[PDB]
Amino acid sequence: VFHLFHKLLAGQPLPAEMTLAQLLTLLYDRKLPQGYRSIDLTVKLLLETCPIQSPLQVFAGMGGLALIAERL
Structure with a gap:
């Protein structure tokens, strides 16, 4: 079995x-x-x-997608 590790998450296999x-x-x-x-x-x-x-999620959370729709 191969397990991925990160130094910040020391000694903890990451779920696949x-x-x-x-x-x-x-x-x-x-x-x-x-x-x-x-x-x-x-x-x-x-x-x-x-x-x-x-x-895209940040852009929408700032209301950008409504601005797009007004120009579609």
Whole structure:
């Protein structure tokens, strides 16, 4: 069995169905610098976490999509 680990989440195998958005949520909650170039995992041998907000989600949460619809 292969398990993915992150240094911030020390000594904790990551669930195989987490998806990278949820992992980014964890790492940002764990003080990983925002916009860090890459997710550095270790292949050795939390699913409820919300996915990180997409740019579209932020744009809509600021009401941008209503602005788009007024120009469609």
